[PDB]
């Protein structure tokens, strides 16, 4: 999403979680995942979400499909632009043939 | 599976039939200005 | 768990403008668009000279600026299978166009952790590990 | 989970004594005294709780959980037909540097009009060339004959090559096109709004369940709306939804998007995005201070390393256009 | 003239005094947008498929 | 009325060949056949190999 250039390509090769960690028979597993569900209860968790990672950088490949630019292609109106001073001197060319026919 | 390919520098081979038909149709102008120049004639 | 890879991007080619997918075809065809109206000028010969200078090119481009019809009817029936042809080259070239746009793209994922391009270990899918990983 | 405790028969240690709840579904602290199958895993008289329920806190503090095996999460599903709104344009229609060059291809040869009209009415040539590219049919005053009426042939060619690409514009996004209009952006606001910007909402819920706390713990304003709407069963709602007397079900939506792989149709979907409000996990329930959910942690983390579980959901849970 | 209804000719064409011919003309005319409607939609569907 | 007559003609050609409607199972491990339902009746010839 931050960077472009990089797209990930299939699904959920393994499915884990990320705990806490904590030395054997310590006191401190109490109420560690109970504050886990707190800020479940509260969506804390996805306000540090909101902080962080729900800000998308670059765009999706759901496939822009097509796109509505069409800014480089004035070589049609390049080519009109160069006809019209080709129009200018063939006006001095039917001058010349006026004055002759 | 198979899928399809963009089709750039058109096959001209449907043209060739487009001036077929137009030569076929090229050719009754002829006999009717034919039928024209006997239709003066009566 | 799943893979990163770069994207790989189907570039749209803006460029077709100046291209257009005949490329080598419509020059002949405004050739026989020339000889067309020398057909005409010589059907109305014998029995309209600005006319073979223009009302050919302004039938097919839609701005029919001219002497208008012939007197002969059989070079009229010429001109409308001549505009019928102008019809179908339009169309066909709008409906190419169309085509062009957004018929293929070429395909750049992988399919799934079971690839036989990840199953036969080659060269040119070098695969990472980052080391003392759980993985 | 039948599958998985043939798997904890492969890790032998335990063997079975099945009973099947008849009083109370889950477990609800009814003045502090629980029903359900918290009820029986109080009082010893259950002591494995392998039936699919959520590991919450109200929960934990009772009994001894184990490890979570399957992510799961509230959100809600709709039967919805989608679509798209162009609004009164192609959204940006070309490139707006040609699309106001076509003004500037208005000015510049007027100056080359003005020029040849001495070879005048310059704003009767200007709607002429509005009388070009868009096809008027209207009549239009032709000069005697120059490089304006070739450069007439020069735009109408480009007149060709204009219509065709907006023709072929169009029809591109026409055909491809994505369809989402009201996902999550109600769920806080409309739905915390719920009939005071449109006409009322069917809502669905279950009568008893972790759910009706939490959204008494949170959103408890519109509950009392929601009151009315106390479905008791999951295919009584799809039914309902499908009469179109609900408006979305609210739901784990780890059931949810199984059904909706095996709905009939899919015009029946989840909310598409996966965005569960919730974030929780299916475990088992264990007596506390019992030493063997360890071993059988264990277990459950060996079944993991090998990643058995997704034959198994290919086995069960798979659907059908959920793809 | 006619024939310089529906395929669009840009000839030049000779008109009447204005009657159910001319009425003719504008319901041939829509007739005229469904042709080469259907024409395209059928030329791209067959040149994409 | 000239955009109005394009969008007419690139919604015919959308509505000509946008979509065709799922007929086909997903092979012999279809949850349709995993799942034995109703809707689905399979039959075998009696007294074969299969």
């Known amino acids: ?74 070589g049609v109106f390049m080519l009109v632009a160069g006809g019209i001073v080709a129009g200018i001197f063939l006006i001095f060319i039917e001058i010349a043939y006026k004055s002759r026919a | 599976e198979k899928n399809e390919v963009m089709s750039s520098q058109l096959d001209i081979d449907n043209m060739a039939g487009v001036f077929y038909m137009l030569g076929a149709a090229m050719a009754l102008s002829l006999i009717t200005f034919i039928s024209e120049h006997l239709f003066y004639w009566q | 768990l799943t893979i990163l890879v770069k994207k790989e991007i189907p570039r749209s080619t803006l460029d ?44 097919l481009l839609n701005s029919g600026i ?14 409308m299978v001549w505009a019928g042809f102008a019809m179908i080259i339009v169309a066909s070239y709008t409906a190419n166009l169309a ?12 399919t799934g952790i079971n690839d036989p391009r990840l199953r036969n270990p080659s060269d040119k899918f070098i695969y990472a590990t980052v080391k003392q990983s759980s993985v | 989970c039948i599958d998985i405790l043939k ?21 609800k ?112 005053q032709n000069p005697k004959g120059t490089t304006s009426k070739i450069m007439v042939s020069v735009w109408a060619f480009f007149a060709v090559i204009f219509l065709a690409s907006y023709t072929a514009n169009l029809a591109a996004f026409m055909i491809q096109e994505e369809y989402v209009d009201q996902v999550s952006g109600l769920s806080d606001k409309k739905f915390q709004r719920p009939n005071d910007f449109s006409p009322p909402f069917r809502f669905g819920t279950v009568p008893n369940g972790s759910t009706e706390r939490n959204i008494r713990n949170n959103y408890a304003e519109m509950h009392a709306y929601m009151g009315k709407f106390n479905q008791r069963g999951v295919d009584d709602a799809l039914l309902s939804l ?12 780890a059931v949810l998007n199984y059904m909706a792989g095996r709905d009939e149709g899919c015009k029946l979907v989840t909310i598409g995005s996966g965005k569960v409000f919730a ?38 849970l798979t659907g059908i256009c959920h793809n």
């Open chain 3, 66 to 79: 001219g002497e208008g019809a012939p007197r002969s009817f059989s070079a009229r029936i010429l001109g």
């Open chain 3, 99 to 110: 085509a062009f746009l957004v018929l293929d793209r070429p395909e750049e994922r992988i």
């Open chain 4, 242 to 253: 499908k009469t179109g007397k609900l408006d979305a079900f609210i739901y784990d939506a």
């Open chain 4, 29 to 140: 602290k009814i003045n502090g005294t629980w029903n359900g199958m918290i009820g029986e895993v109080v009082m010893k008289r259950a002591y494995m709780a392998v039936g699919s329920l959520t590991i919450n806190e109200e929960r934990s503090e009772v009994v001894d959980f184990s490890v979570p095996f399957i992510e799961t999460g509230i959100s809600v599903m709709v039967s919805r037909s989608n679509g798209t709104v162009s609004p009164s344009a192609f959204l940006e229609p070309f490139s707006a540097c040609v699309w106001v060059m076509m003004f500037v291809m208005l000015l510049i040869v007027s100056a080359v009009a003005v020029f040849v009209f001495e070879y005048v009415t310059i704003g009767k040539a200007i709607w002429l060339l509005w009388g070009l590219v868009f096809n008027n049919s209207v009549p239009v």
């Open chain 1, 1 to 74: 999403s931050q960077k472009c250039d990089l797209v990930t390509t299939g699904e959920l090769f393994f499915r884990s979680g990320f705990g806490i960690g904590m030395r054997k028979d310590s006191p401190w597993k109490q109420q560690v995942s109970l504050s886990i569900l707190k800020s479940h209860e509260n969506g804390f968790m996805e306000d540090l979400d909101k902080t962080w990672v729900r800000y998308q950088e670059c765009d999706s490949r759901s496939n822009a499909p097509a796109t509505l630019t069409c800014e480089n292609m004035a």
């Open chain 3, 16 to 59: 077709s403008f100046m291209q257009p997918f005949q490329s080598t075809l419509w020059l002949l065809v405004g050739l026989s668009v020339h000889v067309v109206a020398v057909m005409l000028y010589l059907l109305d010969r014998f029995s309209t000279l600005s006319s073979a200078m223009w009302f050919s090119w302004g039938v």
């Open chain 4, 279 to 316: 974030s929780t996990g299916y475990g088992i329930a264990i007596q506390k201070d019992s030493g063997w959910k360890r071993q059988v942690d264990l277990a459950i983390l060996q079944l993991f390393g090998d990643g058995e579980m997704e034959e198994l959901e290919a086995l069960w």
């Open chain 4, 7 to 27: 798997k904890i028969s492969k890790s032998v240690k335990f063997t079975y004594d099945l009973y099947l709840v008849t009083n109370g579904k889950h477990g």
